[PDB]
Write a protein that binds this ligand. Structure first.
Ligand code: NA
Ligand code: NA
Length: 76
């Protein structure tokens, strides 16, 4: 029961972001914090955050509005 999955660091970060989506902290259409801000908040490298955001992008959860920021997808 307490045989918890072990994960790579970027996967811990991706899961924390998914959690925030589920709990309504990060809402569809919201601009995500910068890589630097997320790295500091999660106590990980910029590299880990970028890999986590690539994972979310591959899940179709992320987009760009023209440019200058990463946004949670609002409309599928
Ligand atoms: Na592993
Ligand atoms: Na973490």
């Amino acid at each position: 029961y307490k045989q918890i999955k072990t994960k790579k660091i970027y996967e811990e970060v991706a899961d924390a972001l998914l959690d925030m989506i589920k709990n309504g902290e990060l809402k569809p259409g919201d601009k995500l914090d910068s890589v630097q801000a997320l790295a500091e908040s999660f106590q990980v490298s910029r590299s880990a955050v970028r890999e986590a955001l690539s994972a979310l992008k591959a899940m179709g959860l992320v987009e760009m509005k023209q440019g200058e920021g990463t946004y949670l997808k609002e409309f599928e």
